Amino acid sequence: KPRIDMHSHFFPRISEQEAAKFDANHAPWLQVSAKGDTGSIMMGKNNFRPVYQALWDPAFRIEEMDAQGVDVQVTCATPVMFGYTWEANKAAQWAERMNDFALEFAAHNPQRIKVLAQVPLQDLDLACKEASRAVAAGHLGIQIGNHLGDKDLDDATLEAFLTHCANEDIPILVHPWDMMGGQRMKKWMLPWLVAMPAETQLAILSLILSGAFERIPKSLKICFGGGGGSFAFLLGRVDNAWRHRDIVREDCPRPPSEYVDRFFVDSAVFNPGALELLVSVMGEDRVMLGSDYPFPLGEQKIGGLVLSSNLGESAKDKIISGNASKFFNIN
Amino acid sequence: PRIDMHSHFFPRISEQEAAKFDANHAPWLQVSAKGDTGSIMMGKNNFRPVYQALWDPAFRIEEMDAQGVDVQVTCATPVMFGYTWEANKAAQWAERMNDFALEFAAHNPQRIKVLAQVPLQDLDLACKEASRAVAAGHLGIQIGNHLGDKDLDDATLEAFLTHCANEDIPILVHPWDMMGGQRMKKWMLPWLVAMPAETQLAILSLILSGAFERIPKSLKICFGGGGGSFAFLLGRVDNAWRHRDIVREDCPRPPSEYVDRFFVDSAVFNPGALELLVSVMGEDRVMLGSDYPFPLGEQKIGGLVLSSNLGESAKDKIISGNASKFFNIN
Ligand SMILES: [Mg+2]
Ligand SMILES: [Zn+2]
Ligand SMILES: [Zn+2]
Numbered sequence: 315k316p317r318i319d320m321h322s323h324f325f326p327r328i329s330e331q332e333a334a335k336f337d338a339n340h341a342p343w344l345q346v347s348a349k350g351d352t353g354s355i356m357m358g359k360n361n362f363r364p365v366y367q368a369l370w371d372p373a374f375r376i377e378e379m380d381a382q383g384v385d386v387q388v389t390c391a392t393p394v395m396f397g398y399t400w401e402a403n404k405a406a407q408w409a410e411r412m413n414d415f416a417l418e419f420a421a422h423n424p425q426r427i428k429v430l431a432q433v434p435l436q437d438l439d440l441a442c443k444e445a446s447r448a449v450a451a452g453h454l455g456i457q458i459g460n461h462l463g464d465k466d467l468d469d470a471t472l473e474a475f476l477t478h479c480a481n482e483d484i485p486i487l488v489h490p491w492d493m494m495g496g497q498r499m500k501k502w503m504l505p506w507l508v509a510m511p512a513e514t515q516l517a518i519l520s521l522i523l524s525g526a527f528e529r530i531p532k533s534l535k536i537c538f539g540g541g542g543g544s545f546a547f548l549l550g551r552v553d554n555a556w557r558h559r560d561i562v563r564e565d566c567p568r569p570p571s572e573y574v575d576r577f578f579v580d581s582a583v584f585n586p587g588a589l590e591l592l593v594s595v596m597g598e599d600r601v602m603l604g605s606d607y608p609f610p611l612g613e614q615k616i617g618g619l620v621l622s623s624n625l626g627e628s629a630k631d632k633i634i635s636g637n638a639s640k641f642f643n644i645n
Numbered sequence: 646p647r648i649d650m651h652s653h654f655f656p657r658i659s660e661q662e663a664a665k666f667d668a669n670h671a672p673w674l675q676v677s678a679k680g681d682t683g684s685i686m687m688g689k690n691n692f693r694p695v696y697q698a699l700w701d702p703a704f705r706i707e708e709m710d711a712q713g714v715d716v717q718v719t720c721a722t723p724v725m726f727g728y729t730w731e732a733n734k735a736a737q738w739a740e741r742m743n744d745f746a747l748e749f750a751a752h753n754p755q756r757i758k759v760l761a762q763v764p765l766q767d768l769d770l771a772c773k774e775a776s777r778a779v780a781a782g783h784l785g786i787q788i789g790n791h792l793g794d795k796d797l798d799d800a801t802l803e804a805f806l807t808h809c810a811n812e813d814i815p816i817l818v819h820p821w822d823m824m825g826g827q828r829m830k831k832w833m834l835p836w837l838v839a840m841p842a843e844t845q846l847a848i849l850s851l852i853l854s855g856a857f858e859r860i861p862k863s864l865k866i867c868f869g870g871g872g873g874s875f876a877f878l879l880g881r882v883d884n885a886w887r888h889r890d891i892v893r894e895d896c897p898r899p900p901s902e903y904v905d906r907f908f909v910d911s912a913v914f915n916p917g918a919l920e921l922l923v924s925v926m927g928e929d930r931v932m933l934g935s936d937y938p939f940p941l942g943e944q945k946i947g948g949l950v951l952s953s954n955l956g957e958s959a960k961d962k963i964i965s966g967n968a969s970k971f972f973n974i975n
Binding site: 461464466468494495496497498499501502503504506507508509511512515516519523524540544546547548549550551552553554555558559561562564565566583584585587588591594595610611613614 | 796797824825826827828829831832833834836837838839841842845846849850853854870873874876877878879880881882883884885888889891892894895896912913914915917918921924925940941943944
């Protein structure tokens with residue numbers, strides 16, 4: 315009965331040169347200090363965002379997985395690696411290259427470290443190919459971004475991808491990215507605080523209200539990050555709209571709240587009360603422990619929030635261990 | 646007693662009276678022969694179908710009797726903001742609407758009270774208009790968090806709040822639609838996603854910019870629709886403030902400390918969500934709002950509060966207490 319944290323990130327050892335072979339303006343790459351303790355994700359010549367050793371160093375990662383008490387970690391690509399705006403073939407190469415890095419990262423000790431794969435989601439055919447290929451090679455599932463430009467999960471291209479995954483029994487983690495807002499949310503990390511949970515909610519409602527869950531096989535294992543954003547809280551607002559407006563009701567047959575039996579969320583909500591509403595809405599079976607390691611905005615003491623909760627001992631075990639062992643079939 | 650502090654009206658404006666300001670941007674009210682329906686018209690195009698309750702105080706009174714609702718605070722439909730029009734035309738528009746709300750109210754000023762609207766695109770015009778209208782009998786103001794082309798929180802908006810803080814003008818802040826552009830086209834998603842989020846953004850903008858430090862605690866200000874997702878996501882904000890010096894930069898106390906500087910209405914449509922809202926705002930800072938008459942307003946006004954596991958003093962505060970002191974209503 316170990317701790318399994320199923321939402322962490324990594325960034326591969328890519329040089330400006332190798333990145334430039336893909337796109338000297340848009341391919342992210344990794345610059346490490348000469349010491350080797352600090353580092354920066356770089357976009358072309360520009361500095362994207364400063365980072366640290368646990369993101370790229372698998373040996374170093376463990377030592378922190380030890381002091382935190384985490385026994386198995388699922389990790390996946392930092393969202394800046396997605397490449398959804400690039401040209402299909404170039405992106406398909408990129409995903410493959412990235413997914414091999416993830417295996418090299420993982421293979422250092424593939425018992426405590428599982429990976430998820432990225433896919434050229436702008437191109438359905440290549441995206442399925444990469445998903446299958448990658449899982450067959452070791453990955454325990456896929457992580458995708460919650461939208462693709464003006465396409466939300468209700469889009470047929472994205473509904474088809476989910477359907478491929480269900481049929482192939484490949485678990486998906488859905489991550490918000492490329493946040494809405496435009497020029498309204500520069501300061502104070504507002505995009506992490508306002509737009510990310512809104513993106514996630516939108517993803518979730520898009521599946522539910524479009525009807526998608528009626529068409530997508532119940533075998534689909536799908537998980538949303540950040541506790542489903544602000545979903546659980548505004549659900550009542552949503553049922554109410556379904557109950558009193560035909561246009562909200564058109565493509566959605568059952569009341570939206572019944573659909574929480576079709577997906578999973580992570581536990582990253584940062585507040586005991588918020589976590590108790592979340593479990594209430596989702597059930598102890600559908601909530602998995604996620605940290606967002608090693609980003610500053612993640613919980614510094616992984617598992618801490620759940621562990622301190624006024625929750626059943628069985629509930630805690632599930633969220634901390636049980637649910638992801640099933641979901642990702644880690645054993 | 647029982648107060649509804651969140652609701653709307655629209656005026657009996659003809660196409661021609663509208664035409665004066667604009668015959669294609671100023672909205673007007675079309676009414677059927679069997680005056681039970683009709684709709685808000687923009688130019689000559691149907692803008693939105695509208696039930697008789699949205700005008701006619703008489704009819705509303707009778708619905709206010711069915712619904713056990715003793716007093717109602719009602720303000721403009723966001724359509725008639727016009728925070729995009731030229732500063733002066735919008736001040737003249739603002740002027741008229743605020744009179745319309747006064748004739749609407751002069752049909753039962755015990756049971757019907759109104760807030761005014763401002764030409765927020767111009768600080769002075771908006772300031773003056775505000776002072777005038779409360780003096781005219783409006784119990785306060787409703788503003789959006791937007792202008793249509795605004796960025797939601799700058800030193801300008803802060804200045805306005807300060808004016809109202811000083812002249813004791815109470816404020817209801819009401820959310821905008823457009824955040825997600827060419828997305829959210831179906832299922833009323835702007836109402837379900839964009840609006841909650843806008844409202845959380847308005848709140849967090851006051852808190853993280855440090856505005857509450859520079860604003861007189863006499864500021865009386867309420868956020869619509871439960872504060873959007875604010876209460877549920879507050880944990881996330883505190884965590885950021887604690888681990889990112891940039892979040893902390895202009896915010897000297899943890900953001901959750903500032904909940905004593907503002908109010909929220911209770912429309913969260915769910916008992917579990919209402920308990921959490923209360924746990925965060927405290928029973929003293931949540932008021933009963935229905936968003937009547939709109940289809941997405943609560944249908945049985947008060948029902949979620951009345952039917953809850955809150956205390957009994959708690960319920961009297963939400964139903965009655967808070968709104969009495971907030972607006973000054975006895
Ligand atoms: Mg589309
Ligand atoms: Zn993440
Ligand atoms: Zn409203």
